Amino acid sequence: SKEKFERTKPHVNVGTIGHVDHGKTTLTAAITTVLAKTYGGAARAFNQIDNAPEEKARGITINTSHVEYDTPTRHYAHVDCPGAADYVKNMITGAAQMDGAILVVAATDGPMPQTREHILLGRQVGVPYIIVFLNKCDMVDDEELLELVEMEVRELLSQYDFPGDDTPIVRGSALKALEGDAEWEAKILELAGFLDSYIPEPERAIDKPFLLPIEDVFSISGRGTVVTGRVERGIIKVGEEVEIVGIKETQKSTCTGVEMFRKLLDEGRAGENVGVLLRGIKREEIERGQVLAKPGTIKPHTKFESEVYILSKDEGGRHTPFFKGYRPQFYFRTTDVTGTIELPEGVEMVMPGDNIKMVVTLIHPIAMDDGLRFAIREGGRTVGAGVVAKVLS
RNA sequence: GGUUUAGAACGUCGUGAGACAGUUCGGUCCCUAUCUGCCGUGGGCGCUGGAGAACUGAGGGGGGCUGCUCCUAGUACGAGA
Numbered sequence: 001s002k003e004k005f006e007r008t009k010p011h012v013n014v015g016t017i018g019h020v021d022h023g024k025t026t027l028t029a030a031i032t033t034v035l036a037k038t039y040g041g042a043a044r045a046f047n048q049i050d051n052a053p054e055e056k057a058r059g060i061t062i063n064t065s066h067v068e069y070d071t072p073t074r075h076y077a078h079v080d081c082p083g084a085a086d087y088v089k090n091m092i093t094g095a096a097q098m099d100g101a102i103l104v105v106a107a108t109d110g111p112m113p114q115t116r117e118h119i120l121l122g123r124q125v126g127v128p129y130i131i132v133f134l135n136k137c138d139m140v141d142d143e144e145l146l147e148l149v150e151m152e153v154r155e156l157l158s159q160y161d162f163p164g165d166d167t168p169i170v171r172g173s174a175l176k177a178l179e180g181d182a183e184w185e186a187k188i189l190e191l192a193g194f195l196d197s198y199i200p201e202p203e204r205a206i207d208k209p210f211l212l213p214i215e216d217v218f219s220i221s222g223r224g225t226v227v228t229g230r231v232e233r234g235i236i237k238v239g240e241e242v243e244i245v246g247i248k249e250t251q252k253s254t255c256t257g258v259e260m261f262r263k264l265l266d267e268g269r270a271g272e273n274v275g276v277l278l279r280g281i282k283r284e285e286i287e288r289g290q291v292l293a294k295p296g297t298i299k300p301h302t303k304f305e306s307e308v309y310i311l312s313k314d315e316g317g318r319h320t321p322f323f324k325g326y327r328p329q330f331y332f333r334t335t336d337v338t339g340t341i342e343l344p345e346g347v348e349m350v351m352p353g354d355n356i357k358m359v360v361t362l363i364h365p366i367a368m369d370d371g372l373r374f375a376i377r378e379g380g381r382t383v384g385a386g387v388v389a390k391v392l393s
Numbered sequence: 394g395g396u397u398u399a400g401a402a403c404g405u406c407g408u409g410a411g412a413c414a415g416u417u418c419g420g421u422c423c424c425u426a427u428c429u430g431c432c433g434u435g436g437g438c439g440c441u442g443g444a445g446a447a448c449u450g451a452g453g454g455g456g457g458c459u460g461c462u463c464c465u466a467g468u469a470c471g472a473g474a
């Protein structure tokens with residue numbers, strides 16, 4: 001916290017996606033070192049990304065570790081999700097902010113079970129565009145075998161609603177480009193070109209009132225409690241009133257300071273990932289899941305009508321009916337919450353692969369409006385997405 | 394140290410002397426090796442004229458334990474761990 005971040009170049013929220021032990025932290029670490037040397041960004045290393053006793057004794061990503069690197073045209077803000085079966089909740093918070101993704105497949109193994117589950121989760125939340133990166137290559141010195149894997153990735157995307165053949169499948173090692181090989185360094189500089197060319201400049205909302213869903217809370221020793229998250233809409237100013245709304249109850253506060261990757265900001269606008277400092281609030285009372293709205297706009301609710309689209313075996317969901325009393329997990333913006341379903345009159349059962357309305361009573365109150373969407377999950381697998389119809393409370 | 398001498402006590406059994414894999418405190422462990430055996434170490438004669446060396450090797454003996462850490466490799470395997 002020292003340098004004022006000057007607002008040059010359009011901000012793009014990027015993140016990696018992939019299977020476990022399949023290239024991801026190494027991919028980001030290579031992007032950090034390569035873009036530092038040629039284009040003249042900040043250095044950093046692979047050690048600073050993933051850290052602590054829990055992510056070393058095993059050697060896996062559990063929390064969402066972020067990076068900020070720059071190119072001539074645009075400015076990027078990377079996110080490394082955990083990619084594993086047990087940590088799928090905190091993966092969704094990183095994936096929700098992401099506009100243009102970097103999928104990671106491997107030329108040795110190929111497609112894996114969670115590579116399918118990641119892409120299935122992304123569309124229901126909000127991932128318009130996606131790029132593939134074959135992160136091994138050099139392990140198999142053969143032209144025929146490597147190109148057979150390229151064919152399999154186009155099938156995954158085209159089956160599950162995407163361009164498929166139009167998506168640029170770049171190839172190359174991360175470990176060779178990390179240390180400094182001239183042929184492999186330039187092949188990741190080519191991926192930087194595809195991030196600019198393929199993914200467009202995302203359209204932000206700088207008009208409708210201020211909102212900020214919290215992905216993860218912090219406690220800076222000196223200043224107080226800080227809350228990170230993408231500014232989903234509107235603008236923030238250092239001094240304005242900020243009514244916290246969500247789980248538990250509803251608190252009043254003021255914005256002490258906005259920052260972007262340990263650098264100051266006056267006007268933190270919509271689209272970019274910023275960490276807002278609060279006035280006289282503790283680490284205990286503020287929870288991961290709540291939202292920072294402008295006073296008077298949004299109101300907390302725990303009962304709502306919604307036209308939910310349940311999925312069948314073809315898309316990816318259930319294969320059996322269910323009566324009232326069913327309690328799955330609802331993923332609104334960032335965090336999950338349980339809720340009992342109440343079906344309408346003249347509706348005995350809910351078959352899979354059907355379009356119906358339903359009143360859902362949540363256990364906690366969460367803020368919502370008419371137009372918002374979510375993705376239901378239960379039993380380590382998806383159920384179906386929907387859209388909010390009417391507020392009831 | 395224990396169990397098995399003589400002293401003493403408790404509990405129990407006995408009229409009592411005393412008794413009890415019941416308990417308790419105290420209580421002399423001798424021998425210079427002839428022979429076999431064994432570990433060493435010589436003298437004698439032999440090995441066919443005598444002497445000094447250096448070998449060969451039948452045969453015999455000794456020795457043979459094993460952890461942890463890296464590399465291959467976070468590779469095969471495994472949906473993940």
Ligand SMILES: Nc1nc2c(ncn2[C@@H]2O[C@H](COP(=O)(O)OP(=O)(O)OP(=O)(O)O)[C@@H](O)[C@H]2O)c(=O)[nH]1
Pocket residue numbers: 017018019020021022023024025026027059060061080081082083084135136137139172173174175
């Ligand atoms: N030889 C080679 N090894 C690679 C390459 N990319 C990744 N690896 C290996 O894979 C390991 C990195 O695993 P990650 O993908 O970071 O594991 P992770 O963070 O759990 O992955 P996610 O679950 O996707 O978050 C390293 O120890 C590398 O040895 C590559 O291009 N070539």
Ligand SMILES: [Mg+2]
Pocket residue numbers: 024025026050060061080081082
């Ligand atoms: Mg990682």
Ligand SMILES: [Mg+2]
Pocket residue numbers: 021058059
């Ligand atoms: Mg591992």
Ligand SMILES: [Mg+2]
Pocket residue numbers: none
């Ligand atoms: Mg004694």
Ligand SMILES: [Mg+2]
Pocket residue numbers: none
């Ligand atoms: Mg005695």
Ligand SMILES: [Mg+2]
Pocket residue numbers: none
């Ligand atoms: Mg004595």
Ligand SMILES: [Mg+2]
Pocket residue numbers: none
């Ligand atoms: Mg003696």
Ligand SMILES: [Mg+2]
Pocket residue numbers: none
């Ligand atoms: Mg021998």
Ligand SMILES: [Mg+2]
Pocket residue numbers: 459
């Ligand atoms: Mg051995």
